[PDB]
């Protein structure tokens, strides 16, 4: 019964330490036993993942930012809900939340790569689709006896060609 006494004593400590005092100490130990008996409903002290969810909820309570989690957990937000929530990112607090979504937006942008854009004109005509959406580009390859190549590519379909 080591875990079912230790977590009950933990909730005794983290509910007596609140500025929200326990004169309804019987209500608060009812809340604690409800919390622990839904907490075991994932594991029943038979799975290694028991302590992880306990650490999540425990240090979310003892976080401060925020202390208002104590008030909302004593005035509502019932404990069998908060095994099945797994809302650790979602709670305590919302400024850290909006920080995380800015971080996720920044990472999703920065993981995108190179997108060289291939400026087009209507001067030539494609071979496949025969459209004047030529993604043209110009450069020199051969020896000194000639100018540039007149490289060609169509951007409407993907057709590369060359002009003589």
């Amino acid at each position: 019964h080591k875990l079912r006494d230790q977590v009950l004593k933990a909730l005794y400590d983290v509910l007596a330490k609140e500025s929200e005092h326990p004169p309804q100490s019987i209500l608060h130990t009812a809340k604690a036993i409800e919390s622990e008996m839904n907490k075991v409903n994932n594991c029943d002290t038979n799975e290694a993942a028991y302590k992880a969810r306990y650490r999540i909820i425990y240090s979310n309570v003892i976080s401060k930012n925020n202390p208002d989690l104590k008030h909302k957990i004593a005035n509502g937000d019932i404990t069998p809900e908060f095994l099945a929530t797994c809302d650790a990112k979602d709670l305590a607090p919302a400024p850290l939340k909006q920080k995380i979504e800015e971080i996720a937006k920044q990472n999703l942008y920065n993981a995108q790569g190179a997108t060289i854009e291939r400026s087009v004109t209507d001067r030539f005509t494609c071979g496949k689709c025969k459209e004047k959406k030529v993604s043209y580009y110009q450069l020199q390859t051969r020896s000194a006896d000639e100018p540039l190549t007149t490289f060609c590519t169509c951007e409407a379909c993907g057709n590369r060609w060359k002009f003589s």
């Binding site: 999540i56 990472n107 379909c157 060359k162």
Partner: protein, 307 residues
């Protein structure tokens, strides 16, 4: 025909250019393998059930790319903490009762701190990596770590054994920084997402340029990359044709090799008939294995002495 094919493929190599290796040295490396690459790029298509899901694409890139501790390590400091069950550092004191709700250890604290952004960009929380560094030894390292939600993510570890601390702890620090894998598969590096399109048959019976999302990389492996979920195993493709040979088969190898040489010589100065290039590719592959045309490669064969 082979002589005419040879002269035809030989003519446009004089009109060449010199990112990604192209031109003459790339052609020479491809034609003259050289179990060495210089460009370990491999192309990956997603599962077609995920068309344009960017969160799915970054979940996949996080699943595939290897990282280390040094990918997320910034602050790596060392401390002398005399009390084993009370911190001298005033910030880490609540984590003592977080992990405290097995004594014969040195009073020397190693301490690591990471980035929040460089932690959850790859979508890992600190609890399982503290679990990971716990389980990789479990015998010598008493390992303490915080919550995710703290302002500064911290690791507290000590050496446990029932003078001579600094250099041992420094070497163990260097070892855990240099060796411990986190997720992904090693010899694969940074990965980026292009918004490619693909000509796709229309449901009404036509063709349409439809977008899709792809994966490119700077590292090579084949034996693990089709294993991970959410991936098309079929349409994977790599420039590194020797690995395609080894994993798939020699017919797929000569197909991939012909595709690679066609891309390289069709980058400019295109084109030639397919039959010359196909003849070359298949005569270079028709011995049950790859064979570069060297002084040693094709020549050490049951071939006549005067050629």
């Amino acid at each position: 025909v082979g002589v005419l094919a040879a002269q035809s493929i030989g003519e446009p190599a004089t009109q060449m250019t010199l990112k990604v290796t192209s031109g003459v040295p790339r052609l020479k490396e491809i034609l003259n393998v050289a179990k060495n690459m210089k460009t370990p790029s491999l192309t990956v298509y997603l599962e077609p059930g995920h068309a344009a899901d960017q969160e799915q694409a970054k979940l996949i890139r996080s699943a595939i790319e290897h990282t280390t501790l040094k990918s997320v390590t910034i602050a790596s400091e060392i401390y002398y903490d005399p009390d084993p069950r009370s911190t001298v550092i005033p910030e880490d004191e609540e984590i003592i009762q977080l992990h405290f709700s097995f004594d014969q250890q040195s009073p020397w604290l190693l301490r690591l701190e990471l980035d929040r952004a460089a932690m959850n960009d790859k979508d890992l929380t600190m609890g399982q990596v503290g679990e990971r560094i716990k389980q990789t030894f479990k015998n010598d390292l008493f390992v303490i770590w915080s919550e995710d939600n703290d302002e500064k993510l911290i690791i507290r570890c000590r050496v446990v054994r029932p003078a001579e601390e600094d250099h041992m702890l420094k070497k163990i620090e260097n070892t855990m920084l240099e060796n411990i894998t986190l997720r992904g598969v090693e010899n694969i590096e940074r990965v980026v997402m292009m918004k490619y399109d693909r000509k796709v048959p229309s449901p009404t019976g036509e063709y349409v340029k439809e977008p899709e999302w792809v994966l490119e990389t700077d590292g090579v492996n084949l034996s693990e990359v089709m294993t991970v979920p959410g991936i098309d195993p079929t349409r994977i493709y790599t420039n590194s044709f020797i690995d395609i040979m080894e994993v798939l088969g020699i017919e797929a190898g000569r197909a991939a090799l012909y595709k690679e040489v066609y891309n390289v010589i069709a980058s400019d100065g295109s084109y030639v008939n397919y039959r010359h290039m196909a003849l070359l590719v298949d005569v270079m592959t028709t011995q049950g294995g790859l064979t570069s045309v060297t002084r040693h490669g094709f020549n050490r064969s049951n071939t006549g002495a005067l050629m």
